Amino acid sequence: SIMKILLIGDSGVGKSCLLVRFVEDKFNPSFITTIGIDFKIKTVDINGKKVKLQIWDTAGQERFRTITTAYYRGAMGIILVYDITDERTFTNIKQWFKTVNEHANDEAQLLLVGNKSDMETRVVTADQGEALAKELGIPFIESSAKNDDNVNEIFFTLAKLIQEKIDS
Amino acid sequence: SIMKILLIGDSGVGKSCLLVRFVEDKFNPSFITTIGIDFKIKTVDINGKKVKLQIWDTAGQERFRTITTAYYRGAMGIILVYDITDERTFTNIKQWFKTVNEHANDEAQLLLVGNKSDMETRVVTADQGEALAKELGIPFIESSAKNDDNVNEIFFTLAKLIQEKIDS
Ligand SMILES: Nc1nc2c(ncn2[C@@H]2O[C@H](COP(=O)(O)OP(=O)(O)NP(=O)(O)O)[C@@H](O)[C@H]2O)c(=O)[nH]1
Ligand SMILES: Nc1nc2c(ncn2[C@@H]2O[C@H](COP(=O)(O)OP(=O)(O)NP(=O)(O)O)[C@@H](O)[C@H]2O)c(=O)[nH]1
Ligand SMILES: [Mg+2]
Ligand SMILES: [Mg+2]
Numbered sequence: 356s357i358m359k360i361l362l363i364g365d366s367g368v369g370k371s372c373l374l375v376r377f378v379e380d381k382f383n384p385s386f387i388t389t390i391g392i393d394f395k396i397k398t399v400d401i402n403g404k405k406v407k408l409q410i411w412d413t414a415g416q417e418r419f420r421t422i423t424t425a426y427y428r429g430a431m432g433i434i435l436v437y438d439i440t441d442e443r444t445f446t447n448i449k450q451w452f453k454t455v456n457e458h459a460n461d462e463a464q465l466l467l468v469g470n471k472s473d474m475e476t477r478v479v480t481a482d483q484g485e486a487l488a489k490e491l492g493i494p495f496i497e498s499s500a501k502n503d504d505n506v507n508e509i510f511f512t513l514a515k516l517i518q519e520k521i522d523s
Numbered sequence: 524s525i526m527k528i529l530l531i532g533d534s535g536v537g538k539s540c541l542l543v544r545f546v547e548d549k550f551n552p553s554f555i556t557t558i559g560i561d562f563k564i565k566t567v568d569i570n571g572k573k574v575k576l577q578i579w580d581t582a583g584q585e586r587f588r589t590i591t592t593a594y595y596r597g598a599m600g601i602i603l604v605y606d607i608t609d610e611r612t613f614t615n616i617k618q619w620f621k622t623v624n625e626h627a628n629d630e631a632q633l634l635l636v637g638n639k640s641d642m643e644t645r646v647v648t649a650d651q652g653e654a655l656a657k658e659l660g661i662p663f664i665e666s667s668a669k670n671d672d673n674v675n676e677i678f679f680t681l682a683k684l685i686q687e688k689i690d691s
Contacts, residue, residue, distance in 0.1 A: 417573060447571050 357407045358517050359429060360510075363451055364436035365444040366415030369470040372500035373436070374412050377510055382501050389414040391422040399511060401518045408514060427458030432513045436468045439479040439497065445469070445487070452491055464516045465493040468509055473499040526685055527577050527597060528678070531619055532604035533612040534583030537638040540668035541604065542580050545678055550669050557582045559590040567679065569686045576682060595626030600681045604636045607647045607665065613637070613655070620659055632684045633661040636677055641667040 362370040371389055376382055378397045393412035398405055411430070413423040427433075435451050437444040448467065455465065469484040471477075481497055488495035496512070498505040530538040539557055543549050546565045561580035566573055579598070581591040595601075603619050605612040616635065623633065637652040639645075649665055656663030664680070666673040 443571065450571065 357409060358431045358514060359409050359411065360432040360434065360513065361411045361413060361426060361430045362434045362436060363413050363423065363455070364415060364434075364468075365438070365441075365447055366417075368415065368436045368438040368441070368444050369500050370415065370434075370436050371412050373468070373470060373498060373506055373509065374410055376500040376503055376506050378410070380503075382503075388416060389419075391419045392426065397510075399514050401514055404518070406514060406518070408510065410510075424454060424458050427455065428460065430459060430463055431517050432464045432466070433459060434466050434468055434509065434513065435493075436470050437479070437484075439469045439471050439484070440474045440476045442478050445479045445483070448487060448491075462520060464513060464520060465491075466509065466513050466516075467491065467493050467495045469495070469497040471499060471501070472497040472504060473502040524574050524686075524689070525577060526574055526599050526682060527579065528600040528602065528681065529579045529581060529594060529598045530602045530604060531581050531591065531623070532583055532602075533606070533609075533615055534585075536583065536604045536606040536609070536612050537668050538583065538602075538604050539580050541636070541638060541666060541674055541677065542578055544668040544671055544674050546578070548671075550671075556584060557587075559587045560594060565678075567682050569679070569682050572686065574682060574686065576678065592622060592626050595623065596628065598627060598631055599685050600632045600634070601627060602634050602636055602677065602681065603661075604638050605647070605652075607637045607639050607652070608642045608644045610646050613647045613651070616655060616659075630688060632681060632688060633659075634677065634681050634684075635659065635661050635663045637663070637665040639667060639669070640665045640672060641670040 378395050391414050395410045397408050411426055433455055435448055437448050467488045485495055496505055532538055546563050559582050563578045565576050567576050579594055601623055603616055605616050635656045653663055664673055
């Protein structure tokens with residue numbers, strides 16, 4: 356069938372790069388901010404089952420974040436992304452979390468992603484992210500759209516979680 | 524949200540220069556006295572919460588101090604500034620304080636600023652300002668619009684205090 360998935364998080368954390376790296380195996384070194392929202396798709400196989408993922412890449416910019424909250428309701432999966440080199444984007448996850456609860460479904464599967472694990476300039480530790488994840492009650496994973504680490508895992512695991520949910 | 528902020532204090536203490544240095548990162552070495560009042564704005568980000576600051580730069584000259592007192596009521600933040608190289612401007616803070624209590628709101632957040640910390644001709648010590656601050660019951664900070672020291676801090680901290688007041 357089809358799974359609607361959203362990527363949310365501060366502007367600059369790498370939502371678009373994780374998406375491009377996953378769907379087109381490329382990486383843009385430049386910063387090309389997302390206006391309002393973007394939409395892509397890819398077919399994944401969940402234990403034999405071929406599932407279509409409709410990925411909604413949202414704008415992190417504050418002004419374009421009203422267009423987004425409207426897409427929350429109806430999403431089967433929501434990926435909250437922060438930048439491990441930017442402490443502010445991590446602290447902001449809590450606010451993103453609240454926004455999600457006010458607009459998402461009940462059965463929506465969340466996932467926290469600490470992106471840019473390839474950077475020596477990291478300021479947010481893996482343990483910090485795991486701790487935030489345990490406190491929010493959602494799964495956690497670190498990634499790097501640049502070196503392509505755990506990028507596919509992000510989407511495959513979220514799909515599997517949603518699918519497991521579909522069986523109940 | 525909208526935070527209305529006022530800068531008051533004797534003519535010549537540096538109210539306009541702290542404002543210009545904050546909003547346009549410049550510094551006028553010349554003395555261009557303010558006639559009655561002036562008004563500027565800048566968007567500040569208090570903990571991931573972008574707020575608009577409407578800065579009202581008042582005239583220090585005695586003849587205009589009537590056009591100003593009218594703007595007191597309704598201000599959320601009030602910055603009382605004195606010149607550390609001019610003892611008279613510091614002693615006058617007490618009178619400025621009284622004027623504020625007669626015209627400001629109850630929830631108005633005050634802040635005492637000793638400006639021109641870059642001058643070797645200082646005559647008012649930091650301890651003296653701290654003492655006046657403790658006696659008046661308001662926060663204190665020293666700045667230099669010229670060398671750009673604690674200039675942003677003045678406005679960021681006042682906004683944070685007002686916001687903390689808000690989330691209540
Ligand atoms: N080193 C490194 N840089 C990355 C990584 N992912 C993204 N970036 C860089 O970080 C910047 C922002 O990435 P981008 O994907 O555009 O961020 P966004 O979250 O989609 N921004 P917006 O919400 O404005 O649309 C870009 O210059 C990009 O190349 C990563 O894993 N490692
Ligand atoms: N050395 C030094 N001079 C400063 C500083 N701030 C302001 N000045 C100088 O003090 C003089 C008057 O500053 P100004 O900002 O106009 O003072 P004001 O409080 O706004 N005066 P008025 O109430 O009449 O409008 C100018 O010559 C200016 O360059 C500072 O931090 N350091
Ligand atoms: Mg983007
Ligand atoms: Mg002035």
